[PDB]
Amino acid sequence: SMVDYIVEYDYDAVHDDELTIRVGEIIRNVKKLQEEGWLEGELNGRRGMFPDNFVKEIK
Amino acid sequence: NLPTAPPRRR
């Protein structure tokens, strides 16, 4: 099924494939891709990468 | 306590 994450800390994108995220946002349809320490997910209509220590998994 | 983003694979 689908995995969602809560944003716990602000992060501004440093590369174009990264999300800019803000505390309180839910990132949806989260996937672990090949990259270590990062995740991929949907936010406000787009997809992108985000650091996995800025967010908490909704279980 | 603020997190530091892990390095990208790059």
From Swiss-Prot, chain A:
<comment type="subunit">
    <text>Homodimer. Interacts with F-actin, PKD2, NPHS1 and NPHS2. Interacts with WTIP. Interacts with DDN; interaction is direct. Interacts (via SH3 2 domain) with CBL (via phosphorylated C-terminus). Interacts with BCAR1/p130Cas (via SH3 domain). Interacts with MVB12A and ARHGAP17. Interacts with ANLN, CD2 and CBLB. Interacts with PDCD6IP and TSG101. Interacts with RIN3. Interacts directly with RET (inactive) and CBLC; upon RET activation by GDNF suggested to dissociate from RET as CBLC:CD2AP complex. Interacts with CGNL1 and SH3BP1; probably part of a complex at cell junctions.</text>
</comment>
<protein>
    <recommendedName>
        <fullName>CD2-associated protein</fullName>
    </recommendedName>
</protein>
<feature type="domain" description="SH3 1; truncated">
    <location>
        <begin position="2"/>
        <end position="59"/>
    </location>
</feature>
<feature type="cross-link" description="Glycyl lysine isopeptide (Lys-Gly) (interchain with G-Cter in SUMO2)">
    <location>
        <position position="59"/>
    </location>
</feature>
<comment type="subunit">
    <text>(Microbial infection) Interacts (via SH3 domains) with Chikungunya virus non-structural protein 3 (via C-terminus); this interaction plays a role in initiation of viral replication.</text>
</comment>
<comment type="function">
    <text>Seems to act as an adapter protein between membrane proteins and the actin cytoskeleton. In collaboration with CBLC, modulates the rate of RET turnover and may act as regulatory checkpoint that limits the potency of GDNF on neuronal survival. Controls CBLC function, converting it from an inhibitor to a promoter of RET degradation. May play a role in receptor clustering and cytoskeletal polarity in the junction between T-cell and antigen-presenting cell. May anchor the podocyte slit diaphragm to the actin cytoskeleton in renal glomerolus. Also required for cytokinesis.</text>
</comment>
Swiss-Prot record, chain B:
<comment type="similarity">
    <text>Belongs to the RIN (Ras interaction/interference) family.</text>
</comment>
<protein>
    <recommendedName>
        <fullName>Ras and Rab interactor 3</fullName>
    </recommendedName>
</protein>
<comment type="function">
    <text>Ras effector protein that functions as a guanine nucleotide exchange (GEF) for RAB5B and RAB31, by exchanging bound GDP for free GTP. Required for normal RAB31 function.</text>
</comment>
<comment type="subunit">
    <text>Interacts with CD2AP, RAB5B, RAB31 and BIN1.</text>
</comment>
